[PDB]
Enzyme design. Structure first.
Site, mmCIF file in Angstrom:
data_model
loop_
_atom_site.group_PDB
_atom_site.id
_atom_site.type_symbol
_atom_site.label_atom_id
_atom_site.label_comp_id
_atom_site.label_asym_id
_atom_site.label_seq_id
_atom_site.Cartn_x
_atom_site.Cartn_y
_atom_site.Cartn_z
ATOM 1 N N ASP A 1 -10.221 -4.602 -4.709
ATOM 2 C CA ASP A 1 -9.596 -3.683 -3.773
ATOM 3 C C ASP A 1 -10.275 -2.317 -3.869
ATOM 4 O O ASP A 1 -10.244 -1.682 -4.919
ATOM 5 C CB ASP A 1 -8.107 -3.594 -4.092
ATOM 6 N N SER B 1 0.832 -1.192 0.000
ATOM 7 C CA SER B 1 0.000 0.000 0.000
ATOM 8 C C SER B 1 0.877 1.257 0.000
ATOM 9 O O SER B 1 1.730 1.404 -0.877
ATOM 10 C CB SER B 1 -0.982 -0.062 1.143
ATOM 11 N N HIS C 1 -7.911 -5.747 0.055
ATOM 12 C CA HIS C 1 -6.710 -4.921 0.015
ATOM 13 C C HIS C 1 -5.508 -5.651 0.613
ATOM 14 O O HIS C 1 -4.448 -5.739 -0.003
ATOM 15 C CB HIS C 1 -6.983 -3.565 0.690
HETATM 16 O O1 LIG Z 1 -3.129 -3.767 6.625
HETATM 17 C C1 LIG Z 1 -3.417 -2.598 6.374
HETATM 18 C C2 LIG Z 1 -4.132 -1.764 7.384
HETATM 19 O O2 LIG Z 1 -5.024 -0.783 6.863
HETATM 20 C C3 LIG Z 1 -4.474 -0.003 5.864
HETATM 21 C C4 LIG Z 1 -4.891 1.311 5.749
HETATM 22 C C5 LIG Z 1 -4.344 2.103 4.764
HETATM 23 C C6 LIG Z 1 -3.392 1.580 3.900
HETATM 24 C C7 LIG Z 1 -2.796 2.458 2.842
HETATM 25 O O3 LIG Z 1 -1.591 2.692 2.879
HETATM 26 N N1 LIG Z 1 -3.668 2.983 1.874
HETATM 27 C C8 LIG Z 1 -5.126 3.010 1.976
HETATM 28 C C9 LIG Z 1 -5.691 4.420 2.077
HETATM 29 C C10 LIG Z 1 -5.231 5.250 0.906
HETATM 30 C C11 LIG Z 1 -5.776 6.668 0.913
HETATM 31 O O4 LIG Z 1 -5.520 7.229 -0.387
HETATM 32 C C12 LIG Z 1 -5.946 8.556 -0.512
HETATM 33 C C13 LIG Z 1 -6.813 9.128 0.394
HETATM 34 C C14 LIG Z 1 -7.213 10.435 0.227
HETATM 35 C C15 LIG Z 1 -6.754 11.177 -0.837
HETATM 36 F F1 LIG Z 1 -7.150 12.454 -0.989
HETATM 37 C C16 LIG Z 1 -5.892 10.615 -1.749
HETATM 38 C C17 LIG Z 1 -5.494 9.309 -1.582
HETATM 39 CL CL1 LIG Z 1 -4.415 8.666 -2.755
HETATM 40 C C18 LIG Z 1 -3.716 5.237 0.864
HETATM 41 C C19 LIG Z 1 -3.120 3.843 0.838
HETATM 42 C C20 LIG Z 1 -2.979 0.261 4.024
HETATM 43 C C21 LIG Z 1 -3.525 -0.538 5.012
HETATM 44 N N2 LIG Z 1 -3.156 -1.890 5.200
#
Ligand SMILES: O=C1COc2ccc(C(=O)N3CCC(COc4ccc(F)cc4Cl)CC3)cc2N1
Length: 288
Positions: free
Chosen positions: A233, A116, A263
């Site tokens: 995802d 991620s 995800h």
């Molecule tokens: O095991 C786990 C535990 O929970 C998790 C939670 C998050 C992630 C993670 O890093 N993510 C998800 C959320 C997105 C948000 O993206 C945006 C939001 C707002 C905006 F304006 C632009 C963008 Cl692009 C970024 C990437 C990974 C995990 N993994």
């Protein structure tokens, strides 16, 4: 004496101090005798390095020295939760750790594994040192902006707000979109080192920086990679994986799609998780 945000002294824990004078908590899994290679594990937003125990243990099983730290503002590291001055801090910090381990174990190939947000960090780390990493394992990496969150309207709104009120936040993610494995969802919900709070505007802008930087970086990226992605995802759309496969210059790139999967592929349904572990195992074996 400096303590973790959970009040444990850093002197009691493996740690490093970053260029900003912040303490980052470190985690190691070392095989017996000489390791064949190094691999850094780079966690995602809101999470921490402890969530990579299983993966890291399996990789140590292959005679790799696995190392990780909690990104600033995450886990047992210092900094206001899920905030950063600029996204590059995360990259800079990974490089410091990598440089340290290479000092200690020289002549060894070094790999990056990222999920991620940590996947974006891994891409940018590799782009910053072309030709240096032996490989990259990307689990549903942050590669493109969510289409409605990237609307020039909200992006304008966010930039405006960030100068007046940066500590406004949007919603907590619905945790059930992380994994079809409801056991794993529960663990996510009950891990005190995970920050489940809403995404702050100031952090969102940095996540938007990262996506932009990753896309600028793809056409110059040559590192071998394995890319794993779930078809369902909702956090990192599968489309980003196809964009990655298309734009990267890497001569050695492989994609696996997991039909219906969410995800967190390494904490998905058993049939998906065992596949993930096996595929990473094979891919790293063959390149060590
Ligand atoms: O095991 C786990 C535990 O929970 C998790 C939670 C998050 C992630 C993670 O890093 N993510 C998800 C959320 C997105 C948000 O993206 C945006 C939001 C707002 C905006 F304006 C632009 C963008 Cl692009 C970024 C990437 C990974 C995990 N993994």
């Amino acid at each position: 004496p400096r303590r973790t945000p959970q009040s444990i002294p850093y002197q009691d824990l493996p740690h490093l101090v970053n260029a900003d004078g912040q303490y980052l908590f470190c985690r190691y899994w070392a095989p017996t005798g000489t390791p064949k290679a190094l691999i850094f594990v780079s966690h995602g937003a809101g999470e921490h390095s402890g969530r990579y125990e299983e993966l890291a243990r399996m990789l140590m099983g292959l005679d790799l020295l696995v190392f990780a730290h909690d990104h600033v503002g995450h886990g047992q590291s210092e900094g206001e939760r899920m905030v950063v001055s600029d996204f590059h801090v995360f990259v800079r910090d990974v490089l410091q750790h990598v440089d340290s381990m290479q000092k200690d174990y020289p002549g060894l190939p070094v790999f990056l594994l990222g999920h991620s947000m940590g996947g974006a960090i891994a891409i940018l780390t590799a782009a910053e040192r072309p030709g240096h990493f032996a490989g990259m394992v990307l689990i549903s990496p942050l590669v493109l902006a969510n289409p409605e969150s990237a609307t020039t309207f909200k992006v304008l709104a966010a930039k405006v707000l960030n100068s007046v009120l940066p500590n406004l936040s949007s919603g907590p993610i619905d945790s059930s979109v992380l994994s079809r494995n409801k056991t794993e969802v529960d663990i996510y919900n009950s891990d005190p080192l995970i920050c489940r709070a809403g995404l702050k505007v100031c952090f969102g802008i940095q996540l938007l920086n990262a996506v932009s930087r990753v896309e600028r970086a793809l056409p110059k990226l040559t590192v071998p990679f394995l890319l794993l992605q779930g078809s369902a995802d909702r956090l990192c759309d599968s489309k980003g994986a196809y964009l990655l496969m298309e734009l990267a210059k890497s001569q050695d790139k492989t994609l696996k799609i997991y039909e219906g999967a969410y995800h967190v592929l390494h904490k998905e349904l058993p049939e998906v998780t065992n596949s993930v572990f096996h595929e990473i195992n094979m891919w790293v074996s063959q390149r060590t």
